[PDB]
Enzyme design. Structure first.
Site, PDB file in Angstrom:
ATOM      1  N   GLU A   7      -0.307   9.524   1.047  1.00 28.96           N
ATOM      2  CA  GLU A   7      -1.016  10.495   1.870  1.00 28.96           C
ATOM      3  C   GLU A   7      -0.940  10.145   3.355  1.00 28.96           C
ATOM      4  O   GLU A   7      -0.822  11.026   4.206  1.00 28.96           O
ATOM      5  CB  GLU A   7      -2.496  10.589   1.456  1.00 28.96           C
ATOM      6  CG  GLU A   7      -3.354  11.385   2.446  1.00 28.96           C
ATOM      7  CD  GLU A   7      -4.705  11.819   1.870  1.00 28.96           C
ATOM      8  OE1 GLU A   7      -5.571  10.949   1.612  1.00 28.96           O
ATOM      9  OE2 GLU A   7      -4.890  13.042   1.680  1.00 28.96           O
ATOM     10  N   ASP A   8      -1.000   8.859   3.663  1.00 35.34           N
ATOM     11  CA  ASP A   8      -0.999   8.417   5.054  1.00 35.34           C
ATOM     12  C   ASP A   8       0.266   8.549   5.904  1.00 35.34           C
ATOM     13  O   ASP A   8       0.183   8.938   7.070  1.00 35.34           O
ATOM     14  CB  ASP A   8      -1.519   6.980   5.125  1.00 35.34           C
ATOM     15  CG  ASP A   8      -2.954   6.873   4.661  1.00 35.34           C
ATOM     16  OD1 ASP A   8      -3.757   7.744   5.052  1.00 35.34           O
ATOM     17  OD2 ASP A   8      -3.281   5.928   3.912  1.00 35.34           O
ATOM     18  N   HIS A  46     -11.804   6.250   6.731  1.00 37.71           N
ATOM     19  CA  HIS A  46     -10.935   7.420   6.657  1.00 37.71           C
ATOM     20  C   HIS A  46     -11.777   8.678   6.517  1.00 37.71           C
ATOM     21  O   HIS A  46     -12.688   8.724   5.699  1.00 37.71           O
ATOM     22  CB  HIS A  46      -9.996   7.323   5.450  1.00 37.71           C
ATOM     23  CG  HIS A  46      -8.601   6.907   5.797  1.00 37.71           C
ATOM     24  ND1 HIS A  46      -7.580   6.885   4.870  1.00 37.71           N
ATOM     25  CD2 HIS A  46      -8.055   6.502   6.969  1.00 37.71           C
ATOM     26  CE1 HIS A  46      -6.467   6.482   5.456  1.00 37.71           C
ATOM     27  NE2 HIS A  46      -6.727   6.243   6.729  1.00 37.71           N
ATOM     28  N   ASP A  70       0.786  -1.231   0.000  1.00 40.11           N
ATOM     29  CA  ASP A  70       0.000   0.000   0.000  1.00 40.11           C
ATOM     30  C   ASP A  70       0.821   1.286   0.000  1.00 40.11           C
ATOM     31  O   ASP A  70       0.252   2.368   0.138  1.00 40.11           O
ATOM     32  CB  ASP A  70      -0.932   0.015   1.215  1.00 40.11           C
ATOM     33  CG  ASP A  70      -1.949  -1.107   1.184  1.00 40.11           C
ATOM     34  OD1 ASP A  70      -2.848  -1.070   0.320  1.00 40.11           O
ATOM     35  OD2 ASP A  70      -1.847  -2.030   2.022  1.00 40.11           O
ATOM     36  N   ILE A 119      -9.739  -1.042  -3.534  1.00 35.36           N
ATOM     37  CA  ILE A 119      -9.091  -1.137  -2.234  1.00 35.36           C
ATOM     38  C   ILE A 119      -9.252   0.130  -1.406  1.00 35.36           C
ATOM     39  O   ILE A 119      -8.348   0.534  -0.668  1.00 35.36           O
ATOM     40  CB  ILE A 119      -7.591  -1.503  -2.371  1.00 35.36           C
ATOM     41  CG1 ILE A 119      -6.894  -0.552  -3.340  1.00 35.36           C
ATOM     42  CG2 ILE A 119      -7.460  -2.952  -2.834  1.00 35.36           C
ATOM     43  CD1 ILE A 119      -5.437  -0.885  -3.573  1.00 35.36           C
ATOM     44  N   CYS A 136      -5.578  10.053  -1.727  1.00 32.74           N
ATOM     45  CA  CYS A 136      -4.680   9.075  -1.102  1.00 32.74           C
ATOM     46  C   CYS A 136      -3.339   8.893  -1.787  1.00 32.74           C
ATOM     47  O   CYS A 136      -2.342   8.588  -1.142  1.00 32.74           O
ATOM     48  CB  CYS A 136      -5.344   7.685  -1.054  1.00 32.74           C
ATOM     49  SG  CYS A 136      -7.007   7.625  -0.322  1.00 32.74           S
TER      50      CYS A 136
HETATM   51  C1  LIG Z   1      -6.832   6.367   0.882  1.00 30.07           C
HETATM   52  C2  LIG Z   1      -5.673   5.604   0.932  1.00 30.07           C
HETATM   53  C3  LIG Z   1      -5.665   4.409   1.646  1.00 30.07           C
HETATM   54  N1  LIG Z   1      -6.748   3.994   2.277  1.00 30.07           N
HETATM   55  C4  LIG Z   1      -7.886   4.703   2.253  1.00 30.07           C
HETATM   56  C5  LIG Z   1      -9.114   4.183   3.005  1.00 30.07           C
HETATM   57  O1  LIG Z   1      -8.730   3.554   4.231  1.00 30.07           O
HETATM   58  C6  LIG Z   1      -7.956   5.903   1.557  1.00 30.07           C
END
Ligand SMILES: *c1ccnc(CO)c1
Length: 248
Positions: A59-60, A156, A54, A237, A243
């Site tokens: 972004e996370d 999210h 992932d 996903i 993101c």
């Molecule tokens: C953007 C990126 C990764 N995951 C999400 C939803 O949990 C949104």
């Protein structure tokens, strides 16, 4: 406005509404970049890392503000190490201005929405109370501000929200009637195009997922230059346009 974009090529291990097809996903990400290529910003495209399926969702791992960058700490243990493979890039853009979230606090920047110098943090299974508290402390340290938003039927915060500047806010699901957002020109997103609630403003351009006419029309009528990109492999996903990049 923004000057810089950071993104990361998706890994083949990404594949592990159905599983994503790598080749297909690779093309959509390329089209995503090309769209950003017209927004008068430079793009720092990082290499794929097969160890983090992932990692494409940059972004996370970080929250980039106008005064500092804050390295987060993903709730997902399998994504936690994504902060280390991006630290150096962040460092290069924010020398002497990097902060970070410490255990046991957890934070994913996907749960944070920037509105001027204020930041709305969605407390979820990915961003705990301790995590949000730390973030808010750092923000208030740099003259910025932050607040927590409890989310019920959402993973999210940014899944059903998107601030397009000029007080315009796309909202879907549980967000439409929340007290915190009553003062924004709220553009409700039909439950049928709820995915399109995740859009990104980039220097007056608004990049959105392809296939959502009502929302598209709404955004166009607001005065934004709309650019739609097909991100169907990422939808599989829970991933949207917000993101896949860092914007600052
Ligand atoms: C953007 C990126 C990764 N995951 C999400 C939803 O949990 C949104």
């Amino acid at each position: 406005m923004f000057k810089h974009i950071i993104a990361r090529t998706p890994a083949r291990s990404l594949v592990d509404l159905g599983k994503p097809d790598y080749a297909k996903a690779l093309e959509q990400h390329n089209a995503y970049i090309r769209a950003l290529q017209t927004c008068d910003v430079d793009i720092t495209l990082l290499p794929p890392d097969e160890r983090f399926p992932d990692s494409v969702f940059v972004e996370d791992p970080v929250l980039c503000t106008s005064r500092c960058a804050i390295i987060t700490r993903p709730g997902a243990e399998s994504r936690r190490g994504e902060t280390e493979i991006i630290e150096e890039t962040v460092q290069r853009f924010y020398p002497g201005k990097v902060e970070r979230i410490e255990a046991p606090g957890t934070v994913e920047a996907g749960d944070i929405m920037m509105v001027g110098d204020h930041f709305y943090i969605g407390e979820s299974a990915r961003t705990n109370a301790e995590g949000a508290r730390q973030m808010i402390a750092i923000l208030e340290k740099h003259g910025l501000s932050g607040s927590v938003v409890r989310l019920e039927k959402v993973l999210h915060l940014k899944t059903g929200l998107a601030y397009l500047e000029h007080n315009n806010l796309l909202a879907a699901g549980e967000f439409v009637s929340k007290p915190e957002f009553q003062d924004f020109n709220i553009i409700e997103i039909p439950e049928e195009e709820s995915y399109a609630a995740n859009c990104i403003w980039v220097n007056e351009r608004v990049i959105m997922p392809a296939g959502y006419p009502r929302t598209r029309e709404k955004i166009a009528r607001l005065g934004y230059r709309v650019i739609e990109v097909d991100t169907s492999e990422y939808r599989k996903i829970d991933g949207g346009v917000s993101c896949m990049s860092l914007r600052f």
